[PDB]
Amino acid sequence: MSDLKKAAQQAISLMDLTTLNDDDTDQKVIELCHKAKTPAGDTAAICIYPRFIPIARKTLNEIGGDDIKIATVTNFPHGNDDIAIAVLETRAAVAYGADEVDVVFPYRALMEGNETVGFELVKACKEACGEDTILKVIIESGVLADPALIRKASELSIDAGADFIKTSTGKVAVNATLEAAEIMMTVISEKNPKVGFKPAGGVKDAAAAAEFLGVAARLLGDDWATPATFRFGASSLLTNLLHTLELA
Amino acid sequence: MSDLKKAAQQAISLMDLTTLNDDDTDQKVIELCHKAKTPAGDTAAICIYPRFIPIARKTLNEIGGDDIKIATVTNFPHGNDDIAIAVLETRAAVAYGADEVDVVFPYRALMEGNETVGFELVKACKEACGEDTILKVIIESGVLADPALIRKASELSIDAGADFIKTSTGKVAVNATLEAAEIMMTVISEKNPKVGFKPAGGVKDAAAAAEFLGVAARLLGDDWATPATFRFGASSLLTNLLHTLEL
Ligand SMILES: [Cl-]
Ligand SMILES: [Cl-]
Ligand code: NA
Ligand code: NA
């Protein structure tokens, strides 16, 4: 379907193609780099564990992937409230050569009533990134669950300097939801439309992708979603999108 | 045994207590930190994968392990000849908070006749260590095998700024040998006695530790081996040494 095909095409261009598994290997990351060069155009990025960034950058720069960004994760997936540890991991991610770092918000601390440590952790990790590395903040909306907490995590993250707010780690029972997307992009519209949104997990197919893009278009404008403002964090979405486009 | 127990005690004080397994976890690294606080005194260091450095430092600083160093590995275990990758990994190790980085020498390239990349990779990684992180260079002497190659990798590494030269990754068939130790510490005595030596893997027991220390004593002097100049890289030696000390 043309509406569906347009969504599939845009979703691929906005994808953070991800592999974050305990049994990941250089070989598997190399294969992911090749997969990022899709028949429908390059994805926006790949997302991998920090130690695989050097071989991924080497590989992308060998296969025409020079403009595919490398994102990684820190404070992950636990979202513990030790700022020092999150900062060290973020510094290492930057040193490996990450273009983007997706850090996990201390959501358990927020749920216990501590708003300060979330703000300070994001602020400290953004400082470790600098002006030239993107920081995405995973608020784990699927666990926060409560709309007020989702909103508060989003506000704290943006005030602390987040470049993106991201729904989920993909490691818990509930990942990206439309309900969370509504809240988070509303907060973005209220505070700073330069801040991006990243639904991660929970995006089945092109139809689901279209739904998330539809919320963005509605709240922030038809042209708002771009690689600089919107990413799909996905490990098993691309093949379905390619089938929607009748490829692979 | 008196001489044996003295060797065991010293070997513990010089140990880089190591865990480098594909199934390593935060929990296993925390347990290793506690194990480094041995009944015979603290080990010199622990050696773990870079991503575990932050939780290891937090743990050591909680449990009286403040003076136990954290070493890690880069370009590991392959010793590939891509300098850019080895340097990025070394920069990351430093950023994680490593006190020491054990980088693998491009030993296959040397066996193919390329001395240049060995020198250049060690030199670049030493630069990435900055001022506050020392560099150990793993030459994989058990694979180099030939005395000329073991000597050459040692010389190249030291000229390139290595703070230690280290026999092995522990991930190949042959690790530390007494023959390699002889050659490597002879090169140290020739060039710079401030450079350290680290036999890694294949140190069986107190008797074997005593043999390696005996080589150091003969080539460099009775008082030469210290935490700043000698480490045992070991993942399964400590329990044996404690049994020798009857602990
Ligand atoms: Cl990692
Ligand atoms: Cl690692
Ligand atoms: Na982690
Ligand atoms: Na490695």
Residue numbers in the entry:
A (entry chain B): 1 to 248
B (entry chain A): 1 to 247
What do the authors report?
The 2-deoxy-D-ribose-5-phosphate aldolase (DERA) is an enzyme involved in nucleotide catabolism. The enzyme catalyzes the formation of C-C bonds between an aldehyde as an electrophile and acetaldehyde as a nucleophile in a highly stereoselective manner. The structures display a canonical TIM barrel fold built up of eight β-α repeats in a toroidal arrangement, with an additional N-terminal helix (α0) directly adjacent to the C-terminal helix α8 (vide infra). Furthermore, all DERAs investigated in this study form constitutive dimers.
The X-ray structures of both psychrophilic DERAs were determined with resolutions of 2.1 Å for C. psychrerythraea and 1.8 Å for S. halifaxensis. Superposition of the structures with those of meso- and hyperthermophilic DERAs revealed a high similarity of the monomeric units, with root-mean-square (r.m.s.) deviations (RMSD) in the range of 0.63–1.65 Å. We note that the relative orientations of protomers as well as the characteristics of the dimer interface for both psychrophilic DERAs closely resemble the situation in the mesophilic (E. coli) enzyme. Comparing the substrate binding pockets of the new structures with DERAEC, no amino acid exchanges or significant conformational differences were found within a radius of 5 Å about the natural substrate (as represented by the covalent intermediate included in PDBID 1JCL12). DERAs from psychrophilic species had a similar thermostability and were around 20 K less stable than DERAEC. In contrast, helices 5 and, particularly, 6 and 7 show markedly reduced strengths of rigid contacts in the psychrophilic enzymes. The relative B-factor distribution of the backbone atoms reveals a tendency towards increased flexibility in helices 0, 6, and 7 of the psychrophilic DERAs, compared to DERAEC. Hence, our X-ray structures provide independent clues in favor of the hypothesis that adaption to low temperatures in psychrophilic DERAs involves a more flexible environment of the substrate binding pocket. In the reduced state (i.e., without formation of the disulfide bridge), the A95C mutation turned out to negatively affect the stability of DERASH and DERAEC, but did not influence the stability of DERACP. While in DERASH and DERAEC the melting point of the oxidized form was still lower than the wt value, the exchange led to a marked increase of 8.4 K in thermostability in the case of DERACP.
